[PDB]
Amino acid sequence: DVVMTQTPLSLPVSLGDQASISCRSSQSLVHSNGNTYLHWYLQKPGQSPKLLIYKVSNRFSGVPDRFSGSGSGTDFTLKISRVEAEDLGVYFCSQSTHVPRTFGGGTKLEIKRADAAPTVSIFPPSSEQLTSGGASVVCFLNNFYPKDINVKWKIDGKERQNGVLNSWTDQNSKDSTYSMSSTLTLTKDEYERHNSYTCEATHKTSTSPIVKSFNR
Amino acid sequence: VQLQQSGAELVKPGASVKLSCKASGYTFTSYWMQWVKQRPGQGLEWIGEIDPSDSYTNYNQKFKGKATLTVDSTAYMQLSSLTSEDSAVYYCANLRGYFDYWGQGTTLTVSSAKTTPPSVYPLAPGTTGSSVTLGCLVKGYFPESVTVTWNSGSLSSSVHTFPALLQSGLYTMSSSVTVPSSTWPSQTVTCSVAHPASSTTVDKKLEP
Ligand SMILES: O=c1[nH]cnc2c1ncn2[C@@H]1O[C@H](COP(=O)(O)OP(=O)(O)O)[C@@H](O)[C@H]1O
Ligand SMILES: [Zn+2]
């Protein structure tokens, strides 16, 4: 069918600056009836897409003039004049000149903000889980920036590679920071053989690794 | 104008399922009802359309014998011979220029695995700081959809909810909330976990 291409696939921009998302069609989007049906949607995590600009430059209801769409034939540009913290998400260009209607892959808007060291919290397994025979020890590394971080688990000084799960949230729209959780799962037996559990993170805002441990 | 769909559906491979789209706030018999599919790794594929006033329909080639639209004021899309590839979010939408409305989307999980309720465990620190972070661990459930709220969702400013992960054959996620040190444990915080698929609603009080 007609293939839409978006440039770039990810775009880091400072609050207050302008952003330009490109979309290109394999074919001309000019319909025989004269119109060019190229649209732009903004999709926020866990949300259905919402239309920003239809037919190249017309704004949907309530959309601010920060957003402007332009282009012609096969070349189209979506511009945001004042990137705002809650503008982050994935921008899709779609076309309905040709059947079937098709969409681009999406461009992820990422906000560039100042460095922030993560806050680390470590939690011992609860009595209720220990009771069931399992033991997950958790570590939350909240509100940091940039997203590049390394987490390491240590049991009585010995590094633990296996049995650990990591999950990170996407950039937070409120403060443009990231978060992550690292969970080390053990049996109630393994957990009870050792004393101190350490959660250690290395981030560029540190130089010296952030450490948080509880002795049992 | 609101287009409401079912939140989720679990079906075994080889089976067939009917997803509804109840239209409200306008004249169904006007705008064509569209269906779009989106799989986690963002990329939307168009499926087809149906004219409520005719029942005239238009399908995308790739979904020729997969989808089968009908209307009634609701609109239905029925799929067939479900495979793992069919596990996606299915939206119904009215896409007519300035008249653009999408439903919430129905998450369709094609799997043989049986529904399993989650085990919720509290994460209380084992102190310190001007504010303390607390959390809940939702462990071993299926299918995916679980919602964690704090103080019935009234405590929402410092919450971080982390994405589910497959641990064993079940899902696992955690959620954190940061409150002022002086307020805990003087005031209690509770995390509520709702697993619709298993008709589960568990509350957990966070005690030291
Ligand atoms: O998304 C679309 N793709 C292709 N044709 C469309 C689309 N939307 C409208 N048309 C059709 O082409 C026509 C032009 O009307 P349109 O709805 O574009 O607004 P306009 O008349 O204000 O320019 C109508 O016949 C209409 O049914
Ligand atoms: Zn040891």
Side-chain angles (χ1 to χ4, degrees), chain B residues 11 13-15 17-26 28-38 40-60 62-63 65-113 115-126 129-167 169-173 175-187 189-204:
Chain B
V11 293
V17 61
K18 247 175 193 172
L19 305 183
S20 62
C21 180
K22 176 168 289 196
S24 181
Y26 73 101
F28 198 52
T29 191
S30 309
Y31 304 90
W32 286 66
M33 185 57 73
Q34 312 280 310
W35 284 83
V36 187
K37 158 182 170 170
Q38 182 180 27
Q42 285 171 119
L44 309 96
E45 292 176 338
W46 185 69
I47 290 167
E49 62 197 314
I50 178 169
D51 199 35
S53 46
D54 282 319
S55 209
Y56 284 4
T57 205
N58 240 247
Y59 292 77
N60 170 3
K62 309 171 69 166
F63 303 92
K66 252 289 179 59
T68 163
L69 305 323
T70 329
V71 283
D72 172 43
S73 306
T74 80
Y76 298 86
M77 165 169 78
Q78 192 217 291
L79 282 145
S80 309
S81 314
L82 307 168
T83 163
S84 309
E85 161 70 65
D86 284 36
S87 287
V89 188
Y90 288 97
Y91 301 98
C92 61
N94 278 161
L95 309 175
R96 221 297 199 300
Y98 74 96
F99 187 86
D100 195 283
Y101 292 99
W102 298 64
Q104 306 177 15
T106 304
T107 309
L108 200 273
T109 307
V110 171
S111 198
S112 36
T115 286
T116 306
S119 294
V120 186
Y121 301 116
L123 308 180
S130 40
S131 55
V132 63
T133 295
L134 305 163
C136 276
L137 183 66
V138 192
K139 205 166 178 298
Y141 61 88
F142 190 91
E144 215 295 279
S145 305
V146 126
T147 299
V148 191
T149 59
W150 290 94
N151 285 40
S152 286
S154 51
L155 222 45
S156 64
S157 56
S158 54
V159 180
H160 290 117
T161 297
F162 307 91
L165 249 40
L166 255 340
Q167 185 166 53
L170 307 325
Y171 288 116
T172 306
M173 73 150 74
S175 187
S176 78
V177 68
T178 304
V179 300
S181 253
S182 58
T183 75
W184 196 79
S186 67
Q187 302 168 30
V189 325
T190 305
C191 69
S192 304
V193 175
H195 193 227
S198 62
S199 297
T200 298
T201 301
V202 178
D203 287 334
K204 219 77 205 176

Side-chain angles (χ1 to χ4, degrees), chain A residues 155-157 190 193-197:
Chain A
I155 305 185
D156 288 327
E190 251 271 278
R193 268 155 215 153
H194 307 282
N195 308 24
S196 68
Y197 293 73

Side-chain angles (χ1 to χ4, degrees), chain A residues 31 33 35 37 39 55 95-98 101, chain B residues 95-97:
Chain A
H31 199 248
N33 80 359
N35 288 326
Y37 303 86
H39 317 311
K55 289 171 72 174
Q95 75 81 30
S96 51
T97 286
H98 304 268
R101 176 184 314 259
Chain B
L95 309 175
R96 221 297 199 300

